[PDB]
Amino acid sequence: ALDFVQQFARMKEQLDTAKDQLAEAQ
Amino acid sequence: ALDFVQQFARMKEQLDTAKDQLAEAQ
Protein backbone atom coordinates (compact mmCIF):
# COMPACT_ATOMS: atom_id res chain seq x y z
CA ALA A 1 0.00 0.00 0.00
CA LEU A 2 2.74 2.46 0.92
CA ASP A 3 4.79 1.27 -2.04
CA PHE A 4 1.85 1.69 -4.39
CA VAL A 5 1.25 5.21 -3.09
CA GLN A 6 4.86 6.10 -3.87
CA GLN A 7 4.63 4.52 -7.33
CA PHE A 8 1.44 6.45 -8.03
CA ALA A 9 3.17 9.68 -7.06
CA ARG A 10 6.07 8.98 -9.43
CA MET A 11 3.64 8.13 -12.25
CA LYS A 12 1.90 11.44 -11.63
CA GLU A 13 5.21 13.23 -11.92
CA GLN A 14 6.06 11.39 -15.15
CA LEU A 15 2.68 12.36 -16.58
CA ASP A 16 3.25 15.99 -15.63
CA THR A 17 6.65 15.97 -17.33
CA ALA A 18 5.14 14.43 -20.46
CA LYS A 19 2.43 17.09 -20.54
CA ASP A 20 5.09 19.77 -20.15
CA GLN A 21 6.94 18.31 -23.14
CA LEU A 22 3.72 18.33 -25.14
CA ALA A 23 3.09 21.97 -24.27
CA GLU A 24 6.66 22.79 -25.27
CA ALA A 25 6.31 21.07 -28.64
CA GLN A 26 2.99 22.79 -29.33
CA ALA B 1 10.01 -5.38 -1.56
CA LEU B 2 13.37 -5.75 -3.29
CA ASP B 3 11.61 -5.88 -6.65
CA PHE B 4 9.63 -2.75 -5.86
CA VAL B 5 12.81 -0.94 -4.83
CA GLN B 6 14.37 -1.78 -8.19
CA GLN B 7 11.23 -0.70 -10.05
CA PHE B 8 11.19 2.58 -8.14
CA ALA B 9 14.81 3.20 -9.11
CA ARG B 10 14.05 2.60 -12.80
CA MET B 11 11.02 4.93 -12.60
CA LYS B 12 13.27 7.59 -11.10
CA GLU B 13 15.68 7.19 -13.98
CA GLN B 14 12.85 7.42 -16.53
CA LEU B 15 11.62 10.60 -14.86
CA ASP B 16 15.11 12.08 -14.96
CA THR B 17 15.41 11.29 -18.66
CA ALA B 18 12.02 12.87 -19.34
CA LYS B 19 13.04 16.01 -17.47
CA ASP B 20 16.26 16.12 -19.48
CA GLN B 21 14.22 15.95 -22.68
CA LEU B 22 12.01 18.77 -21.42
CA ALA B 23 15.04 20.92 -20.65
CA GLU B 24 16.42 20.17 -24.11
CA ALA B 25 13.18 21.18 -25.82
CA GLN B 26 12.94 24.38 -23.79
XYZ file of all heavy atoms in Angstrom, unseen atoms left out:
260
model
N 0.823 -1.202 0.000
C 0.000 0.000 0.000
C 0.859 1.256 0.000
O 0.667 2.152 -0.829
C -0.939 -0.011 1.204
N 1.824 1.329 0.915
C 2.744 2.462 0.922
C 3.555 2.505 -0.364
O 3.739 3.573 -0.970
C 3.671 2.372 2.135
N 4.028 1.341 -0.803
C 4.788 1.270 -2.036
C 3.946 1.709 -3.222
O 4.427 2.436 -4.100
C 5.311 -0.147 -2.229
N 2.685 1.290 -3.268
C 1.852 1.694 -4.390
C 1.583 3.186 -4.357
O 1.484 3.822 -5.409
C 0.534 0.930 -4.417
N 1.439 3.764 -3.167
C 1.253 5.210 -3.093
C 2.463 5.928 -3.675
O 2.328 6.879 -4.461
C 0.974 5.641 -1.644
N 3.664 5.474 -3.318
C 4.862 6.104 -3.870
C 4.931 5.942 -5.389
O 5.272 6.892 -6.112
C 6.104 5.518 -3.202
N 4.605 4.752 -5.887
C 4.628 4.520 -7.327
C 3.620 5.400 -8.044
O 3.883 5.897 -9.143
C 4.353 3.049 -7.622
N 2.450 5.586 -7.444
C 1.436 6.447 -8.028
C 1.917 7.888 -8.086
O 1.670 8.595 -9.068
C 0.156 6.328 -7.212
N 2.612 8.335 -7.042
C 3.166 9.684 -7.055
C 4.168 9.856 -8.188
O 4.145 10.863 -8.911
C 3.819 9.994 -5.711
N 5.035 8.859 -8.373
C 6.074 8.978 -9.430
C 5.403 8.918 -10.809
O 5.874 9.637 -11.710
C 7.197 7.957 -9.238
N 4.341 8.116 -10.969
C 3.639 8.126 -12.245
C 2.987 9.475 -12.502
O 2.971 9.951 -13.642
C 2.596 7.016 -12.317
N 2.434 10.098 -11.462
C 1.896 11.444 -11.632
C 2.970 12.395 -12.117
O 2.729 13.218 -13.006
C 1.308 11.969 -10.326
N 4.160 12.304 -11.535
C 5.213 13.234 -11.921
C 5.682 12.974 -13.348
O 5.962 13.919 -14.098
C 6.361 13.149 -10.922
N 5.745 11.702 -13.754
C 6.062 11.388 -15.146
C 5.017 11.956 -16.091
O 5.355 12.493 -17.153
C 6.160 9.880 -15.348
N 3.743 11.823 -15.736
C 2.683 12.361 -16.579
C 2.790 13.870 -16.693
O 2.590 14.436 -17.774
C 1.323 11.967 -16.018
N 3.094 14.543 -15.586
C 3.247 15.990 -15.629
C 4.403 16.390 -16.532
O 4.294 17.349 -17.304
C 3.450 16.536 -14.220
N 5.521 15.669 -16.450
C 6.646 15.971 -17.327
C 6.286 15.752 -18.790
O 6.667 16.548 -19.658
C 7.854 15.127 -16.948
N 5.556 14.677 -19.085
C 5.144 14.429 -20.461
C 4.232 15.536 -20.970
O 4.357 15.976 -22.119
C 4.449 13.073 -20.567
N 3.307 15.996 -20.132
C 2.433 17.087 -20.544
C 3.216 18.372 -20.756
O 2.895 19.160 -21.651
C 1.328 17.293 -19.518
N 4.241 18.605 -19.938
C 5.093 19.768 -20.150
C 5.814 19.679 -21.486
O 5.924 20.675 -22.211
C 6.095 19.899 -19.008
N 6.306 18.492 -21.833
C 6.939 18.314 -23.135
C 5.956 18.574 -24.263
O 6.310 19.171 -25.285
C 7.498 16.905 -23.269
N 4.721 18.099 -24.109
C 3.716 18.329 -25.139
C 3.435 19.812 -25.307
O 3.324 20.308 -26.434
C 2.434 17.578 -24.798
N 3.312 20.536 -24.195
C 3.087 21.973 -24.275
C 4.258 22.664 -24.948
O 4.072 23.592 -25.741
C 2.851 22.547 -22.881
N 5.473 22.214 -24.649
C 6.657 22.792 -25.269
C 6.650 22.580 -26.776
O 6.912 23.512 -27.549
C 7.896 22.168 -24.640
N 6.342 21.360 -27.213
C 6.314 21.070 -28.641
C 5.231 21.871 -29.347
O 5.454 22.401 -30.443
C 6.121 19.574 -28.866
N 4.052 21.980 -28.732
C 2.994 22.789 -29.326
C 3.411 24.243 -29.437
O 3.136 24.902 -30.446
C 1.712 22.684 -28.510
N 9.382 -6.575 -2.117
C 10.009 -5.383 -1.561
C 11.280 -5.026 -2.318
O 11.458 -3.880 -2.750
C 10.305 -5.594 -0.078
N 12.170 -5.999 -2.504
C 13.372 -5.755 -3.295
C 13.010 -5.411 -4.731
O 13.572 -4.478 -5.328
C 14.279 -6.983 -3.254
N 12.054 -6.145 -5.291
C 11.614 -5.877 -6.648
C 11.017 -4.485 -6.763
O 11.280 -3.768 -7.736
C 10.611 -6.942 -7.077
N 10.219 -4.076 -5.780
C 9.634 -2.746 -5.862
C 10.699 -1.675 -5.735
O 10.591 -0.618 -6.360
C 8.562 -2.541 -4.799
N 11.725 -1.913 -4.921
C 12.806 -0.937 -4.831
C 13.481 -0.769 -6.187
O 13.745 0.355 -6.638
C 13.809 -1.347 -3.740
N 13.753 -1.883 -6.867
C 14.370 -1.785 -8.188
C 13.463 -1.054 -9.178
O 13.927 -0.209 -9.961
C 14.722 -3.180 -8.695
N 12.167 -1.360 -9.151
C 11.232 -0.697 -10.052
C 11.163 0.794 -9.776
O 11.054 1.605 -10.701
C 9.849 -1.324 -9.920
N 11.206 1.172 -8.504
C 11.192 2.580 -8.140
C 12.438 3.283 -8.652
O 12.369 4.425 -9.122
C 11.078 2.698 -6.626
N 13.588 2.613 -8.573
C 14.812 3.197 -9.106
C 14.700 3.438 -10.604
O 15.079 4.504 -11.107
C 16.000 2.289 -8.798
N 14.148 2.459 -11.326
C 14.046 2.603 -12.802
C 13.028 3.701 -13.135
O 13.269 4.435 -14.110
C 13.763 1.264 -13.487
N 11.946 3.827 -12.353
C 11.023 4.926 -12.602
C 11.687 6.269 -12.351
O 11.440 7.235 -13.082
C 9.761 4.796 -11.758
N 12.522 6.359 -11.315
C 13.269 7.592 -11.096
C 14.125 7.921 -12.301
O 14.197 9.079 -12.726
C 14.158 7.483 -9.861
N 14.792 6.918 -12.857
C 15.677 7.187 -13.982
C 14.885 7.596 -15.220
O 15.311 8.484 -15.972
C 16.554 5.971 -14.247
N 13.717 6.984 -15.435
C 12.848 7.416 -16.527
C 12.406 8.858 -16.345
O 12.373 9.634 -17.306
C 11.620 6.519 -16.624
N 12.035 9.227 -15.121
C 11.621 10.598 -14.858
C 12.756 11.572 -15.120
O 12.542 12.654 -15.678
C 11.130 10.728 -13.424
N 13.969 11.211 -14.713
C 15.111 12.080 -14.959
C 15.353 12.254 -16.450
O 15.637 13.365 -16.915
C 16.353 11.519 -14.276
N 15.241 11.171 -17.220
C 15.411 11.286 -18.664
C 14.335 12.169 -19.281
O 14.617 12.976 -20.175
C 15.395 9.907 -19.309
N 13.091 12.028 -18.821
C 12.020 12.869 -19.341
C 12.272 14.336 -19.027
O 12.043 15.211 -19.872
C 10.676 12.424 -18.773
N 12.741 14.629 -17.817
C 13.043 16.010 -17.470
C 14.197 16.546 -18.301
O 14.208 17.727 -18.666
C 13.353 16.126 -15.984
N 15.179 15.700 -18.605
C 16.263 16.123 -19.483
C 15.740 16.459 -20.869
O 16.158 17.452 -21.477
C 17.330 15.037 -19.559
N 14.821 15.645 -21.387
C 14.218 15.950 -22.680
C 13.465 17.268 -22.636
O 13.505 18.051 -23.592
C 13.267 14.839 -23.100
N 12.741 17.514 -21.546
C 12.008 18.768 -21.423
C 12.955 19.955 -21.412
O 12.696 20.974 -22.063
C 11.155 18.755 -20.161
N 14.058 19.844 -20.674
C 15.037 20.923 -20.648
C 15.629 21.144 -22.028
O 15.851 22.286 -22.443
C 16.135 20.614 -19.636
N 15.879 20.060 -22.756
C 16.416 20.172 -24.105
C 15.446 20.902 -25.026
O 15.845 21.804 -25.775
C 16.716 18.775 -24.633
N 14.168 20.533 -24.973
C 13.178 21.179 -25.823
C 13.027 22.652 -25.475
O 12.929 23.503 -26.369
C 11.840 20.455 -25.708
N 13.015 22.979 -24.182
C 12.940 24.380 -23.785
C 14.147 25.156 -24.281
O 14.016 26.296 -24.744
C 12.835 24.507 -22.272
